[PDB]
C-alpha cells in the first residue's frame, strides 16, 4: 500500500530483482538527499559499468533527458519507472527526485520490485504539521523523529510554534534563544533540510506588541537571528490574544514590512505565513471588517491560516469558499486534530476524516495541529500526509491501518485495538467529537437494552463483548512490553494501564451477569469495586496536568456499557436477595449526602459534579485552602464554624466536613 497513493499508477504482473550489478546514471548531479537514500538501498550490491541502468536526476539533467515528457510539470512532481532493463527516478525538481525515492523505497519488498510506471505530484502545495498546541512542547528527540517521518511521507512543512515556548510568545519573543536551545534549533533546521522539509519558525507577539518602531525592530532582529541559525521560512501568529495586537491594519502593515524589508531582501526565503485573530468563521464578527481588511491589505504572496467554521472543525467546500472570498487567496488550513490540549485526559488515536476531498485547489496548504504526545500523533500525521498529497484517493480506514502498521509493525493489531477504543474526545466546550468503538457499539446497545428491560439478550452480542474485553487485555499487556517504539509506549502507558483495568472490569461485570450463585456474584462484586479503586489511583497519579488531569479511556461506548450493566445487575441482586449492595460505578474516598451527583477529585480539589437542572465528608482532616461556589466547616461533624463569603478563604484551618460549581481546595 503506497502512501501517499500516487496520482497515476500502472502495475504489471512481473517482478524485478534489485540488481546485484547496476550502473548509476546521474548520481553526481541529482539531489544529494535523494542519492543518499538510493545508495543506502543498494548497500549490499556492487556498482560496475555493466549491469542494470539506474537513471536519477532532475528535469533538465543529462541523466533523465529521455523521459522529460513523462515527468509531470508540477512542483515536487516525479516520474518513476521499473522494468527488466532500467530504473528511472526523475523529479521535476530536487524535492521531486527525493519523493520518487520515498516511493521507490516502499516498492522494494524482499529485494524484489514490481514492474511499474508512476506519474505523481501533490494536489496541495504545502502539507505538514504545526507544533502549535498548549502544553509541554515536543522534546528535541521527538522533533528529530518527526522530521524524518515527514520526509518519508512527503510532508514538506513543519511550523514551529509551541504556545508555551517562552521565546516564541510573550514577553520573551523579543529575546534570542539561549545558546543551548539555539544549537538545537540549528540541528533541527539541518535535519529538516536533509528530509526536504521547510522549517517555518513562528513568532507570537500579539498579546503585548506595541505598534511602534521599537517592537517592530525587535521582531525583525529576532527573525534575523533565526535566519543566522538556518531558518528560511517565517510566520507571525495573532491567535488567542486581546488588545491592540488584534488590529488588522497594523497586522497587515507589519507583515508587509517584514515581506518587503526582510523576506524579499534575503535571497532564499520561502514561506511567509500569518494567523489572524479571527481565525474561524464563528469568531469572525460580521459587525466589523477584520478579514476583508487583511485580505485587501496583506501582500498576496503571504499565507493566511484558517481552522474552518469553528476553532475545532473539519474543512468543507462551503466553508473554504466562505473564507477564500474574504482573504482574496486560498486559505492555508490549520486543522485542529489530533490536538488534545483541551481534553488532556484523552488520547485521540482514531482515523482522520471529515475534510472534503475535492477542494485541493481551494487551499494553499494543509497542516495538522497534533497532540503534545509526538509519537502517538503519527497516526493522524501519516493520514493527513496521505490526504494532502492525494485527496481524491484518500481512504480513511486503510490509511489509519497503514499508519499503525508503519509505526508499530511488531504489534500492529494490538495498537489498532487500543486506538479503536481511544479516539473520542468526550464532552468539551468546542463541541467536537469523534466516533469510537463503532465495531461493537451495536452489540453493546442491543445487550444493554435487553438486559435492562428483562428480555433475553442475544448470545452473539454477549460473546462479542466477551471477545472485546479479552482482546483489550491482550493488547494492553503486549503494548506495555513492546520495545520497537519505546517513546510511543512511554507516551501511552498510563492509558494502557487504564485500558487493561477497563477490560478486566468489563469481564468481571459480565460474569456477574452470568451470575450463577450468590457467593460467586459477591466475589465478582468485590473484585469490581477494587478495580474501580485502582482506576481512581491511576486517574490521580498519572498525567496530573493543571487542566484535565488523569487518564480516561474507552469513554464513548465501553465505560458507559460497563457502568450501566454493573448498576443494573446490582439492582437485580438487591431486589432478588433483599440486599443493599452499593451500585456506584466510580470509586470516591470522600462522601456527600443531601443528590446523586458524584463527587470528583482533581489534584487537591474535591468538587460536586456540575449538572444541568448538602454535606461533604472527607476521608481525613486536611488543611483547607478555599471554597468556591457558583457555609460551615468542621473536623468532627459536631463542632462547626461558619465561613463568610462566590469564594471564601480557609487559611489552612483543619477541615473534614463542609456544609452549605462547588469546590473545596485542600493542602497536599
Ligand atoms: C488560524 C491558525 C491559528 C489557529 N490557532 C489556534 N490557536 C489555539 C491552539 O493553540 C490550540 O492548540 C487549539 C486547540 O485548543 O485552539 C486554538 S487554534
XYZ file of C-alpha atoms and ligand atoms in Angstrom:
686
model
C 0.000 0.000 0.000
C 1.887 3.045 -1.301
C 1.360 6.019 0.986
C 0.582 8.639 -0.087
C -1.123 6.969 -3.084
C 0.423 8.302 -6.321
C -1.694 10.293 -8.759
C -1.136 7.817 -11.626
C -0.039 4.198 -11.319
C 0.224 1.281 -13.797
C 1.429 -2.074 -12.416
C 2.299 -5.190 -14.418
C 2.311 -8.766 -13.103
C 6.103 -9.039 -13.306
C 8.768 -8.711 -10.600
C 12.356 -7.476 -10.946
C 15.229 -8.365 -8.646
C 17.136 -5.452 -7.152
C 20.192 -5.771 -9.427
C 23.309 -7.237 -7.840
C 25.248 -5.295 -10.507
C 23.984 -1.870 -11.597
C 25.206 1.274 -13.350
C 24.174 4.560 -11.735
C 23.410 7.398 -14.145
C 23.281 10.934 -12.777
C 24.415 10.340 -9.201
C 26.709 13.371 -9.292
C 24.034 15.882 -10.380
C 20.859 14.629 -8.666
C 19.516 15.792 -5.295
C 22.156 14.579 -2.788
C 19.483 13.694 -0.205
C 17.866 11.543 -2.891
C 21.171 9.958 -3.971
C 21.980 9.192 -0.328
C 18.709 7.272 0.082
C 19.371 5.351 -3.136
C 22.890 4.290 -2.165
C 21.555 3.055 1.189
C 19.068 0.835 -0.653
C 21.882 -0.578 -2.858
C 24.309 -1.138 0.030
C 24.877 -4.865 -0.489
C 25.116 -4.656 -4.294
C 28.067 -3.696 -6.487
C 28.206 -0.817 -8.981
C 30.074 -1.704 -12.181
C 29.963 -0.155 -15.635
C 27.774 -3.061 -16.781
C 24.575 -4.212 -15.080
C 21.150 -2.674 -14.842
C 20.853 1.030 -15.631
C 19.549 3.328 -12.882
C 18.890 6.916 -14.002
C 18.369 9.522 -11.253
C 18.194 13.275 -11.704
C 16.036 16.349 -12.055
C 14.319 17.566 -15.209
C 16.996 19.252 -17.318
C 19.793 16.982 -16.112
C 21.540 14.843 -18.716
C 20.602 11.685 -16.825
C 16.833 11.979 -17.406
C 16.639 13.873 -20.713
C 14.981 10.831 -22.346
C 11.969 10.861 -20.031
C 11.419 14.623 -19.982
C 7.890 14.357 -21.388
C 6.911 11.719 -18.784
C 7.919 13.953 -15.823
C 4.836 15.812 -14.523
C 5.092 19.606 -14.797
C 4.144 20.261 -11.182
C 6.304 21.323 -8.273
C 7.519 18.267 -6.314
C 6.343 16.039 -9.174
C 8.235 12.983 -10.362
C 8.285 10.110 -12.829
C 9.238 6.623 -11.649
C 9.618 3.550 -13.854
C 10.857 -0.002 -13.249
C 11.182 -2.646 -15.961
C 13.566 -5.518 -16.680
C 16.029 -3.186 -18.451
C 16.317 0.013 -16.408
C 15.134 2.039 -13.421
C 14.214 5.728 -13.774
C 13.874 8.116 -10.802
C 13.236 11.556 -12.308
C 11.915 14.556 -10.409
C 10.520 17.749 -11.812
C 12.783 19.346 -9.176
C 15.126 18.243 -6.399
C 12.312 17.579 -3.955
C 10.505 15.560 -6.612
C 13.516 13.289 -7.021
C 13.593 12.764 -3.259
C 9.875 11.927 -3.312
C 10.477 9.435 -6.138
C 12.920 7.645 -3.862
C 10.470 7.662 -0.965
C 8.028 5.822 -3.235
C 10.840 3.627 -4.575
C 11.672 2.550 -1.006
C 8.097 1.317 -0.449
C 8.155 -0.682 -3.712
C 11.247 -2.618 -2.554
C 9.827 -5.792 -0.962
C 12.183 -8.680 -0.151
C 14.770 -7.450 -2.657
C 12.177 -7.574 -5.465
C 10.454 -4.715 -7.287
C 7.160 -4.559 -9.202
C 7.290 -3.647 -12.877
C 5.577 -0.268 -12.516
C 5.185 3.172 -14.093
C 4.257 6.115 -11.845
C 3.469 9.773 -12.553
C 2.915 11.628 -9.295
C 2.721 15.060 -7.659
C 0.857 16.650 -4.717
C -2.604 18.154 -5.008
C -1.858 20.598 -2.147
C 1.277 22.748 -2.286
C 2.123 22.847 1.446
C 1.494 19.775 3.605
C 2.608 19.093 7.129
C 2.454 19.774 10.847
C 2.238 22.844 13.066
C 3.521 22.320 16.603
C 1.005 24.909 17.715
C -0.582 23.468 20.878
C -0.679 24.443 24.538
C 1.227 22.072 26.829
C 4.694 20.619 27.131
C 6.498 21.280 23.806
C 7.832 18.282 21.935
C 11.242 17.201 23.115
C 14.228 17.648 20.826
C 14.495 13.901 20.208
C 10.775 13.806 19.413
C 11.173 16.606 16.833
C 14.109 14.868 15.149
C 11.994 11.723 14.841
C 9.116 13.805 13.470
C 11.211 15.367 10.687
C 12.375 12.007 9.349
C 8.739 10.826 9.435
C 7.694 13.860 7.365
C 10.305 13.236 4.677
C 9.163 9.629 4.404
C 5.544 10.727 3.912
C 6.193 13.673 1.576
C 5.193 16.329 4.105
C 7.230 19.426 3.224
C 6.203 21.791 6.062
C 6.924 21.954 9.796
C 5.674 25.113 11.520
C 7.355 25.536 14.905
C 5.055 27.424 17.276
C 4.563 25.801 20.714
C 2.351 28.159 22.715
C 4.390 27.534 25.882
C 7.875 28.150 24.410
C 8.754 31.468 26.117
C 10.998 32.639 23.231
C 8.068 32.101 20.855
C 5.355 34.010 22.721
C 5.005 36.977 25.079
C 7.028 38.592 26.542
C 10.303 36.896 25.601
C 9.606 36.638 21.885
C 11.829 39.745 21.984
C 14.820 37.726 23.272
C 17.077 35.475 21.196
C 17.163 31.833 22.162
C 19.920 30.924 24.639
C 22.870 29.080 23.188
C 21.684 25.558 24.097
C 18.234 25.999 22.564
C 19.727 27.835 19.576
C 22.117 24.975 18.794
C 19.182 22.546 18.992
C 17.118 24.637 16.571
C 20.158 24.806 14.280
C 20.291 21.000 14.288
C 16.534 20.819 13.676
C 16.838 23.075 10.622
C 19.645 20.935 9.184
C 17.742 17.678 9.726
C 14.699 19.335 8.143
C 16.786 20.250 5.087
C 18.065 16.656 4.766
C 14.440 15.380 4.811
C 13.139 18.031 2.375
C 11.021 19.854 4.986
C 10.548 23.631 5.217
C 11.213 24.566 8.854
C 8.874 27.523 9.476
C 9.757 29.388 12.703
C 6.725 31.272 14.028
C 6.539 34.171 16.477
C 3.523 35.032 18.653
C 3.967 38.689 19.691
C 0.379 39.837 19.735
C -0.523 39.902 23.406
C 1.914 42.718 24.320
C 3.163 44.101 20.971
C 3.376 47.887 20.788
C 2.709 49.346 17.327
C 5.961 51.321 17.389
C 9.436 51.207 15.862
C 10.968 49.583 18.931
C 8.893 46.393 18.859
C 8.953 46.238 15.044
C 12.759 46.348 15.135
C 12.914 43.700 17.862
C 10.730 41.306 15.881
C 12.947 41.784 12.815
C 16.090 41.326 14.899
C 14.634 38.074 16.224
C 13.861 36.945 12.654
C 17.446 37.842 11.688
C 18.858 35.639 14.487
C 16.661 32.718 13.420
C 17.918 33.238 9.850
C 21.526 33.037 11.093
C 20.504 29.666 12.603
C 19.411 28.481 9.133
C 15.683 29.271 9.179
C 14.299 30.198 5.751
C 10.519 30.295 6.383
C 8.727 32.506 8.920
C 5.307 33.004 10.485
C 3.620 35.638 12.650
C 0.719 34.385 14.781
C -2.011 36.692 16.128
C -4.214 33.930 17.550
C -5.780 33.830 21.037
C -4.945 37.415 22.027
C -6.770 40.534 23.179
C -5.981 44.220 22.917
C -4.213 46.455 20.425
C -2.420 43.454 18.933
C -5.709 42.478 17.239
C -5.704 45.456 14.862
C -5.910 44.078 11.285
C -4.463 47.114 9.527
C -1.468 47.143 11.898
C -1.042 43.384 11.479
C -1.050 43.711 7.697
C 1.343 46.672 7.720
C 3.777 44.689 9.903
C 3.641 41.578 7.696
C 4.109 43.676 4.539
C 7.096 45.388 6.166
C 8.639 42.010 7.048
C 7.881 40.920 3.480
C 9.422 43.946 1.788
C 12.392 44.622 4.124
C 13.335 41.016 5.054
C 11.561 38.248 3.127
C 12.187 39.782 -0.309
C 15.624 41.193 0.630
C 17.169 37.850 1.576
C 17.987 35.649 -1.441
C 16.410 32.401 -0.224
C 13.297 32.845 1.962
C 10.398 30.521 1.063
C 7.160 30.665 3.085
C 5.834 33.738 4.902
C 2.693 32.927 6.889
C 0.402 34.681 9.332
C -2.516 33.585 11.510
C -5.362 36.065 12.039
C -7.067 36.901 15.305
C -10.464 35.954 13.821
C -9.299 32.554 12.595
C -12.566 30.637 12.152
C -15.997 31.600 10.903
C -17.668 31.595 14.323
C -15.061 34.004 15.739
C -15.478 36.361 12.782
C -17.562 39.413 13.685
C -19.964 40.447 10.879
C -20.416 43.812 12.630
C -16.753 44.535 11.752
C -14.430 44.185 8.744
C -11.438 42.249 10.058
C -10.962 39.524 7.432
C -11.568 41.685 4.354
C -9.041 44.207 5.737
C -6.323 41.541 5.910
C -7.415 40.141 2.558
C -7.089 43.510 0.806
C -4.030 44.914 2.605
C -1.800 41.855 3.064
C 0.596 41.273 0.166
C -0.776 38.338 -1.888
C 2.252 36.017 -1.520
C 1.674 35.950 2.245
C -0.340 32.980 3.511
C -3.335 33.409 5.843
C -4.227 30.459 8.061
C -7.709 29.226 8.953
C -9.199 26.482 11.175
C -12.599 26.252 9.462
C -16.092 27.171 10.597
C -15.111 26.757 14.272
C -11.989 26.642 16.426
C -12.152 22.834 16.091
C -13.729 21.838 12.786
C -13.346 19.892 9.576
C -12.937 21.661 6.225
C -15.940 21.763 3.859
C -16.360 23.169 0.364
C -18.778 25.839 1.555
C -16.513 26.678 4.493
C -13.322 27.175 2.484
C -15.289 29.037 -0.189
C -16.501 31.365 2.565
C -13.027 32.309 3.819
C -11.352 32.427 0.380
C -13.836 35.054 -0.804
C -12.803 37.296 2.108
C -8.998 36.850 2.291
C -8.699 37.014 -1.555
C -6.459 33.931 -1.734
C -6.645 30.178 -0.971
C -6.674 29.583 2.769
C -3.777 27.767 4.414
C -5.568 25.246 6.643
C -4.630 24.779 10.304
C -6.577 21.633 11.203
C -7.105 21.182 14.954
C -6.826 17.413 15.037
C -5.487 15.372 16.852
C -4.576 18.240 19.244
C -5.852 17.300 22.718
C -4.749 20.286 24.813
C -8.372 20.979 25.858
C -9.161 17.302 26.623
C -5.778 16.385 28.062
C -7.154 13.298 29.828
C -7.926 11.685 26.410
C -5.713 10.248 23.687
C -7.061 10.897 20.164
C -5.821 7.924 18.144
C -8.708 7.444 15.684
C -8.748 7.939 11.930
C -8.527 11.239 10.109
C -11.822 12.115 8.461
C -14.404 14.811 7.816
C -12.428 17.005 5.401
C -13.754 17.415 1.866
C -11.584 15.522 -0.611
C -12.397 17.626 -3.732
C -11.182 21.086 -2.607
C -7.389 20.778 -3.079
C -7.343 23.740 -5.464
C -9.101 25.872 -2.834
C -6.317 25.653 -0.217
C -2.726 26.898 -0.235
C -1.645 24.465 2.448
C -2.882 21.953 4.986
C -1.217 21.281 8.349
C -2.307 19.330 11.415
C -2.034 20.657 14.963
C -1.103 17.470 16.862
C -1.086 16.170 20.467
C 1.749 17.010 22.804
C 2.279 13.223 22.558
C 4.515 13.284 19.477
C 4.810 9.594 18.565
C 1.087 8.971 19.245
C 0.292 11.814 16.815
C 1.957 9.935 13.955
C -1.280 8.008 13.244
C -3.064 11.236 12.313
C 0.071 12.867 10.838
C 0.607 9.931 8.443
C -3.072 10.092 7.446
C -3.005 13.863 6.841
C 0.083 13.380 4.676
C -1.907 10.923 2.565
C -4.994 13.135 2.401
C -2.973 16.224 1.491
C -0.910 14.580 -1.251
C -3.788 12.725 -2.982
C -7.135 13.802 -1.521
C -9.120 12.339 -4.434
C -7.971 8.841 -3.381
C -7.961 9.347 0.389
C -9.039 6.115 2.104
C -9.730 6.912 5.765
C -9.605 3.458 7.295
C -6.948 1.853 5.098
C -4.684 4.836 5.765
C -5.292 4.560 9.538
C -4.422 0.856 9.441
C -1.361 1.598 7.272
C -0.176 4.291 9.712
C -0.491 1.916 12.678
C 1.358 -0.860 10.834
C 4.175 1.562 9.923
C 4.516 2.955 13.453
C 4.412 -0.387 15.309
C 4.716 -3.310 12.893
C 5.635 -5.736 15.681
C 2.260 -5.187 17.421
C 0.030 -3.515 14.819
C -3.142 -5.458 15.668
C -2.661 -4.589 19.370
C -2.239 -0.887 18.589
C -5.348 -0.995 16.389
C -7.380 -2.484 19.220
C -6.135 0.233 21.575
C -6.602 3.080 19.077
C -10.092 1.883 18.045
C -11.268 2.497 21.627
C -9.235 5.681 22.256
C -10.497 8.172 19.676
C -13.404 10.202 21.085
C -12.721 13.446 22.972
C -15.648 13.199 25.391
C -17.776 16.232 26.232
C -15.933 19.534 25.743
C -16.543 23.232 25.225
C -15.714 23.110 21.496
C -18.434 20.517 20.838
C -16.028 18.411 18.768
C -16.460 14.647 18.913
C -15.164 11.616 17.034
C -16.554 8.126 16.552
C -15.191 5.387 18.806
C -15.718 1.648 19.252
C -18.054 1.577 16.221
C -17.337 -2.135 15.686
C -19.025 -3.245 18.908
C -21.436 -0.372 19.618
C -24.459 -2.133 18.030
C -23.942 -5.267 20.133
C -23.400 -3.169 23.279
C -26.615 -1.202 22.675
C -28.691 -4.313 21.989
C -27.333 -6.172 25.016
C -27.890 -3.318 27.468
C -31.425 -2.529 26.263
C -32.461 -6.180 26.578
C -30.793 -6.674 29.963
C -32.386 -3.528 31.425
C -35.843 -4.494 30.139
C -35.669 -8.073 31.443
C -35.609 -9.520 27.928
C -33.181 -12.186 26.784
C -30.072 -10.675 25.226
C -28.678 -12.336 22.114
C -25.881 -14.798 22.864
C -23.861 -13.426 19.937
C -23.877 -9.936 21.468
C -22.726 -11.274 24.844
C -19.896 -13.179 23.137
C -18.832 -10.094 21.156
C -18.465 -8.168 24.425
C -16.538 -11.069 25.989
C -14.209 -11.197 22.963
C -13.663 -7.431 23.086
C -12.536 -7.437 26.713
C -10.235 -10.430 26.211
C -8.606 -8.721 23.201
C -8.204 -5.428 25.080
C -6.297 -7.258 27.854
C -4.070 -9.000 25.320
C -3.422 -5.693 23.552
C -2.683 -3.762 26.760
C -0.162 -6.290 28.050
C 1.619 -6.663 24.692
C 1.843 -2.917 24.172
C 3.308 -2.337 27.653
C 6.290 -4.577 26.858
C 6.854 -3.533 23.233
C 10.429 -2.323 22.621
C 10.178 -1.366 18.932
C 8.940 2.197 19.601
C 9.807 2.831 23.238
C 8.963 6.570 23.032
C 5.447 5.724 21.828
C 4.940 3.300 24.720
C 6.188 5.867 27.271
C 3.533 8.270 25.970
C 0.562 5.884 26.070
C 1.479 3.684 29.093
C -0.842 5.394 31.646
C -3.776 4.955 29.260
C -2.687 1.380 28.521
C -2.912 0.594 32.257
C -6.360 2.189 32.479
C -7.373 0.336 29.317
C -6.438 -3.009 30.823
C -8.331 -2.214 34.037
C -11.386 -1.281 31.964
C -11.216 -4.658 30.209
C -10.792 -6.564 33.484
C -13.766 -4.706 34.973
C -15.882 -5.466 31.903
C -15.040 -9.172 32.167
C -15.981 -9.309 35.850
C -19.253 -7.460 35.231
C -20.206 -9.964 32.514
C -19.585 -12.798 34.977
C -21.960 -11.065 37.388
C -24.495 -11.143 34.540
C -23.791 -14.855 34.006
C -24.269 -14.900 37.812
C -24.882 -18.472 38.949
C -24.824 -18.377 42.764
C -24.729 -15.768 45.489
C -21.170 -16.228 46.767
C -19.704 -16.207 43.259
C -21.599 -13.000 42.480
C -20.251 -11.362 45.663
C -16.650 -12.264 44.839
C -17.109 -10.622 41.422
C -18.767 -7.588 43.020
C -15.878 -7.151 45.471
C -13.401 -7.566 42.620
C -15.134 -4.906 40.511
C -15.052 -2.473 43.462
C -11.303 -2.983 43.887
C -10.769 -2.404 40.156
C -12.723 0.853 40.441
C -10.305 1.856 43.216
C -7.303 1.006 41.037
C -8.690 3.136 38.179
C -9.093 6.011 40.640
C -5.457 5.598 41.676
C -4.227 5.841 38.058
C -6.553 8.790 37.415
C -4.994 10.596 40.455
C -1.291 9.779 39.947
C -0.780 9.813 36.127
C -0.971 12.752 33.709
C -1.543 15.281 36.512
C -1.589 18.363 34.311
C -3.320 21.507 35.633
C -6.310 21.447 33.233
C -7.737 17.954 32.585
C -5.696 15.721 34.900
C -5.944 11.985 34.803
C -6.411 9.195 32.330
C -9.704 8.446 30.577
C -10.101 5.655 28.030
C -12.797 3.830 26.065
C -15.186 6.559 27.159
C -17.731 6.726 24.326
C -19.182 3.187 24.343
C -17.400 0.773 26.657
C -17.207 2.501 30.053
C -20.907 3.533 29.821
C -21.769 -0.054 28.877
C -19.910 -1.446 31.886
C -21.084 1.210 34.365
C -24.726 0.737 33.322
C -24.524 -3.059 33.247
C -22.947 -3.087 36.719
C -25.590 -0.731 38.115
C -28.403 -2.807 36.623
C -27.207 -6.218 37.811
C -26.553 -4.909 41.324
C -30.113 -3.568 41.380
C -31.329 -7.021 40.301
C -29.248 -8.678 43.040
C -30.576 -6.272 45.684
C -34.119 -6.980 44.504
C -33.611 -10.735 44.470
C -31.866 -11.128 47.853
C -33.305 -8.066 49.630
C -29.731 -6.813 49.862
C -28.195 -3.334 49.826
C -25.062 -3.560 47.711
C -23.773 -0.180 46.592
C -24.172 0.298 42.817
C -21.873 3.344 42.479
C -19.713 2.998 39.363
C -16.692 5.215 40.189
C -14.685 4.994 43.406
C -14.804 8.051 45.652
C -12.963 8.087 49.010
C -14.976 11.083 50.255
C -18.706 11.194 50.908
C -21.556 13.556 50.160
C -25.194 13.480 51.285
C -28.315 15.644 50.999
C -28.269 14.402 45.268
C -26.901 11.522 43.248
C -24.360 13.916 41.721
C -20.990 12.166 42.162
C -18.120 13.893 43.878
C -14.861 14.155 41.941
C -11.226 14.559 42.990
C -8.967 16.661 40.758
C -5.495 17.388 42.094
C -6.069 18.865 45.578
C -9.700 19.737 44.824
C -12.892 17.978 45.927
C -15.887 19.044 43.853
C -19.510 18.198 43.200
C -20.157 17.271 39.578
C -21.977 20.215 37.969
C -25.305 19.288 36.412
C -27.944 20.609 34.034
C -31.170 21.003 36.010
C -25.595 19.178 51.378
C -22.718 17.818 53.488
C -19.305 16.715 52.180
C -17.197 14.492 54.442
C -13.561 13.925 53.506
C -11.687 10.730 54.335
C -9.410 12.613 56.749
C -8.617 16.014 58.218
C -6.723 18.310 55.806
C -5.731 21.972 55.941
C -8.228 23.947 53.875
C -7.331 26.482 51.179
C -10.639 27.865 49.928
C -14.199 27.047 48.937
C -15.663 28.350 45.664
C -19.339 28.187 44.681
C -21.461 29.212 41.678
C -21.421 27.761 54.767
C -19.894 25.821 57.674
C -16.785 23.747 58.365
C -15.945 21.120 60.973
C -13.422 18.428 61.843
C -15.729 16.103 63.844
C -19.134 16.848 62.299
C -20.340 18.059 65.728
C -18.483 21.334 66.379
C -18.994 23.620 63.369
C -17.634 27.005 62.329
C -19.248 29.351 59.812
C -17.304 30.921 56.933
C -18.412 34.152 55.258
C -18.187 34.842 51.512
C -18.643 33.287 45.285
C -15.494 32.484 47.266
C -14.079 32.186 50.783
C -10.616 31.568 52.221
C -9.968 28.846 54.798
C -6.475 29.955 55.899
C -5.224 26.387 56.422
C -7.876 25.694 59.072
C -8.445 21.948 59.628
C -11.347 20.620 57.523
C -13.013 17.221 57.377
C -16.649 18.299 56.876
C -18.153 21.075 54.747
C -21.819 22.078 54.802
C -23.924 24.678 52.998
C -19.641 24.932 40.679
C -18.894 23.709 44.224
C -15.223 23.022 45.017
C -13.131 22.631 48.171
C -9.369 23.036 47.779
C -7.106 21.487 50.433
C -3.361 21.371 51.016
C -1.189 18.445 49.953
C -5.692 30.071 12.017
C -4.482 29.370 12.550
C -4.301 29.708 14.023
C -5.242 28.867 14.882
N -4.746 28.978 16.219
C -5.209 28.334 17.277
N -4.694 28.535 18.424
C -5.177 27.665 19.502
C -4.240 26.485 19.513
O -3.004 26.847 20.122
C -4.863 25.338 20.273
O -3.938 24.249 20.327
C -6.141 24.982 19.552
C -6.772 23.742 20.162
O -7.058 24.028 21.550
O -7.041 26.077 19.685
C -6.588 27.285 19.063
S -6.484 27.241 17.270
